[PDB]
Write a protein that binds this ligand. Sequence first.
Ligand code: HEM
Ligand code: HEM
Ligand SMILES: Cc1cc(N)nc(C[C@@H]2CNC[C@@H]2NCCNCCc2cccc(F)c2)c1
Ligand SMILES: Cc1cc(N)nc(C[C@@H]2CNC[C@@H]2NCCNCCc2cccc(F)c2)c1
Ligand SMILES: C[C@H](O)[C@H](O)[C@H]1CNc2nc(N)[nH]c(=O)c2N1
Ligand SMILES: C[C@H](O)[C@H](O)[C@H]1CNc2nc(N)[nH]c(=O)c2N1
Ligand SMILES: [Zn+2]
Lengths: 407, 411
Amino acid sequence: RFLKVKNWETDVVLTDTLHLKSTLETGCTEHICMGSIVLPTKDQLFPLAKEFLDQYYSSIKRFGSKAHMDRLEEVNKEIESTSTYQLKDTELIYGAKHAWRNASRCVGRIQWSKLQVFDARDCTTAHGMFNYICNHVKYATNKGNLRSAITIFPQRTDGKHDFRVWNSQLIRYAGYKQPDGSTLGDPANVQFTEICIQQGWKAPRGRFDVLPLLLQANGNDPELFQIPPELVLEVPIRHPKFDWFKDLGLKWYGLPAVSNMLLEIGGLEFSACPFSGWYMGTEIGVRNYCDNSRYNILEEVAKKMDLDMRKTSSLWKDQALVEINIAVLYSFQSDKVTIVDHHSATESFIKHMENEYRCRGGCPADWVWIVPPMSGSITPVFHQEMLNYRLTPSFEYQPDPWNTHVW
Amino acid sequence: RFLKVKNWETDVVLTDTLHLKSTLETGCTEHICMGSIVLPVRTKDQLFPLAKEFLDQYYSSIKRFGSKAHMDRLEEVNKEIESTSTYQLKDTELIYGAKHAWRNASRCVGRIQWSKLQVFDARDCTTAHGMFNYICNHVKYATNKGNLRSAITIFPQRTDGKHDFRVWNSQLIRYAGYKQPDGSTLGDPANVQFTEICIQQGWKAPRGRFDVLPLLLQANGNDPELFQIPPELVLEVPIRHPKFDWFKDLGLKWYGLPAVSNMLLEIGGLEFSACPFSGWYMGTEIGVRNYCDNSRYNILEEVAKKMDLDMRKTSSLWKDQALVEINIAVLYSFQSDKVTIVDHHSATESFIKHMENEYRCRGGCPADWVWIVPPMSGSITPVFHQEMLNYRLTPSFEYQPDPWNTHVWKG
Ligand code: HEM
Ligand code: HEM
Ligand SMILES: Cc1cc(N)nc(C[C@@H]2CNC[C@@H]2NCCNCCc2cccc(F)c2)c1
Ligand SMILES: Cc1cc(N)nc(C[C@@H]2CNC[C@@H]2NCCNCCc2cccc(F)c2)c1
Ligand SMILES: C[C@H](O)[C@H](O)[C@H]1CNc2nc(N)[nH]c(=O)c2N1
Ligand SMILES: C[C@H](O)[C@H](O)[C@H]1CNc2nc(N)[nH]c(=O)c2N1
Ligand SMILES: [Zn+2]
C-alpha cells in the first residue's frame, strides 16, 4: 500500500503514497509486465466529475466548503438534464496543468505549473481552429524564447462532432515514397503526407517541407491550411568543430507541439488540445536524425568523419551519434532557440521528483521513456527507481483519425 | 491467450503464448508497474507439484512425456519426497535445469548462448576448502587463456536452510574497495562493505586500486573461510586506447571473467544457494557502469580533462564524448589481448535474433527492457525499439540477500 523507490547511485529512498489515488489500468498484471509496450454515459460521468471537483477544491484549500458543495450540485444538475457539463475557466486551467503534471512519460514536468492555457472552446469551424493554432504557434515560439502552451478546442459531445487536429504535431516535415525505392524527407509522415496530397496539397517534394495542417471541426471533414512560413521558426544544423557538417543540408524546427492526444478532465474529453514546450536535444539528434526508420543519417555522418565502419566494435555509430547531438545543441544555442540537453533535463527531473514526493506523496514516472535514448546511465534518472501509474486529469494517446472518420 | 509485441523500427509483430506457462509474480498490478524496481525452508506439500512441473518440462524436452521412464521418475521422486522430504536431481536434469534458468533469465542479453553452458556438478562438496578447489577449476576452465567459455558450478542444495552453501563474494573476481578517513574511496566503491568483512576475517589488504578480493566461502551453514585465488588464474587486461597514448597512464585494468556468485538457482523446487556462473563481458558493463558510474571508479572527469574537452557546460556533451572513448578503449584492449568481449551493437543484434527464434520455437522469450537496453547509445541498438514482455519462468536465477545479513555466526 505504501511503496518505496530507491535511487541506487545516492541511496536516497522515497515513499510513494500517491499511487493509491490511481485510477486507470496499466496493462501489467501480477503475471506479466508490459512496461515496454508503447500502447498497452450519465452514470459514468458524475463520479468522474466529483472525483475531479473534489481534487480541485482540495487544491484551493476549500474542500467541503459551501462553494465546493454548491459546485458539485450544479454540475450534477447539468449532467442530469444536458448529459454533459462545462468546466469553469479556473477548472480548465487546473485540469490542463494537472494533465501535464500526471504525464508519466514526460521528463520536463518541473515546468508543469507554468503552462499558458488558451481556451478555444468557443471555436466552431476549421478556420477558427487555424486562427487559434497560428496564435498558439506565435505565442509559444516567442522569437526563440519558448513558452509552454496548450490550446483547448470544444469537448467531445456524442462523439460524432469531434474536433481533431489530424497532424501528430503542429509542425512536422513531409515524407514521400520514390520510384528510386527509398524515402525522401521524413519516413514517419509518409501516410499523412499522401492524405494531404489526396486532399489537395501541392507538395514541393523536398526533404524538409513543413506539412499543412488538416483540421477537423465539429466532426466535419477536415480542411487544409498552410501555417504562415514566418511563424515556423527553423534551425539550420552546424557543428562547432566540423565545417563540413552544414553541407549535410540538415534543419529542424524549434517548436515541438504535440497535437494528436486527448486531454481528459473530470470525465470530459478534449480530442483536440495541441500543446507545446521545447525540445530536449536528443529528441532531434538521436531519434529524428538517427532512427533507422527516420532521417537515418548515421551512415552518412560517420563517412564524413572518416571513421572505421568496418567493425561495430570501433563504436563509429556511437562517435557519430555524439557529434550529431553536439551539433543540434550548438545550432539551437547559437540561434537563441530554447533547447535543453539530456543531462540538464534529467537532473531537473530528479529535483522535480523529489519535490513531488515531499509535496504530493509521489510522482508517476515511466522509466522506459524518461531515460534518454543515449548515454542512459550517465544521467541520474537511470539509477532512479520509478513507479508508473495512471492519474487523472491525463493526456491519452488516441488513434489516427483517418481510421475513424467517415467522409 | 495470445499476447503481441511490436518492433517499432521494423514493424515485425510477434505472438507470445509462453507467458501462459508463467506462475511466479512480477511486482506489477493492473494499478502499478514496477518495471524499474530493482528488487520488486519448504513443505512436502508445495514441493512435489514443483518437482512434477519441472519433470514434465524435462521429459517433454526429451520427447518422452508420458513414457514409462517419465512415470517411473515421477513416482521415484514422489517417494523420495514423502520419505526424505526433498529429492536429488539426476545429472541429466541438473544440466537441463541450469541451462533453462539461463534461458529464462529475462534480464540477460547474452541468452543466444544458453544451450552451451558447461555444467560442473559440485553436489559432492562438503567443505569450504572443497568449494575453493571447485571454484579454481571453474575459473581456469572458463578463462581458457582468454578464449572464454561459459560455465556454472553447482554446490549442494538447501536442506533446512540452516546448512546453506554460499559464496559470499557477489562475483568470483572483483576488486577491493577501501573507504579512507577523508571520505574518498580507493579501488571499487561497490565493494567497500565486503572488503571490510574480508579484512575483519583476517585478509591482509594490499590497499591498491585493483586488488583482487579473496574468496569468502561458506559450506554447510558453517562460518565462511577465506581463500586467495591463485593470481596466475586471474586473467586481467590493462586498458589502453587505439589513438590516445595517454590513456594507458590512467592505470586502468579490468579482469576478463565476469562470474556472478550471489544468485540462487531454483530447479524443480530445489534451491541451490551457491551456483557461481560466468560467461564473458559486454564492453559497456566495464566501460559504462564500472568505470563511469558516479558511485564506481567515476573516471569521466579525469578522462575528459586529458581529452581537453570543454567541461564548463554539460551541453558540450563532454561526458558523452569521454564515455564513447573509454568504451572504445575497453573493447580495443580486450580484442588486442585476445580476451573474449562483445560490443553492445553486436550483443543486442544477436539478442533480437535469439528472441525472434525463441518466439518461433518456444512461443515467447521473457525479457526485461530496462536491463536489456545497454547503458549508452540506447536507441541506436535494435532492442530499444523492441517491445518485450517480462514474466517469470522456472527454472530460474533469483536474487538473494547478502549472507552477512542473515548468517548465524557459530564462532
Ligand atoms: C517544457 C519543455 C518540455 C520538455 C523538455 C518535454 C520533454 C518530453 C520528452 C523528452 C518526452 C518523450 C517524448 C518522445 O520521446 O516522444 C515527452 C513526452 C511527453 N510530454 Fe513533455 N516536455 C515538455 C513539455 C510538455 C508540455 C508543455 C506538455 C503538456 C502540456 C507535455 C506533455 C507530454 C506528454 C503527454 C508526453 C508523452 C507523449 C506521448 O506519449 O507521445 N510536455 N516530454
Ligand atoms: C555468455 C555471455 C553473456 C553475456 C554477454 C551476458 C550479458 C549480460 C548482461 C550485460 C547482463 C546485465 C549485466 C548487469 O548490468 O549486471 C546480464 C545479466 C544476467 N545474466 Fe547474462 N550474460 C552472459 C552469460 C550468462 C550466463 C552463462 C548466465 C548463467 C548461466 C547468465 C545469467 C544472467 C542472469 C541471471 C542475469 C541477471 C543478473 C542480475 O539480476 O544481477 N548470463 N547478462
Ligand atoms: C504510437 C505512439 C504512441 C504514443 N504515446 N506516442 C507516439 C509519438 C512518438 C513517441 N515518441 C516519438 C513520437 N513522438 C514525437 C515527439 N514527441 C514530443 C514530445 C514532446 C517533447 C517536448 C515538448 C513537448 F511538448 C512534447 C506514438
Ligand atoms: C541489488 C541487486 C539486484 C540484482 N538482481 N542484481 C544486482 C547486481 C547488479 C546488476 N548490475 C550491476 C550489479 N552487478 C554486475 C554484475 N553483472 C554481470 C552479469 C553477467 C554478465 C556477463 C556474463 C555473466 F555470466 C553475467 C544487484
Ligand atoms: C518498444 C519501446 O517501448 C519503445 O521503443 C520506446 C522506448 N522508449 C521511448 N522513450 C521515449 N522518450 N520515446 C519513445 O518513443 C520511446 N520508445
Ligand atoms: C532503477 C533501475 O531499474 C536500475 O538503475 C537498473 C536500470 N537498468 C539496469 N540494467 C542493467 N543491465 N544493469 C543494471 O544494474 C541496471 N540498473
Ligand atoms: Zn509492469
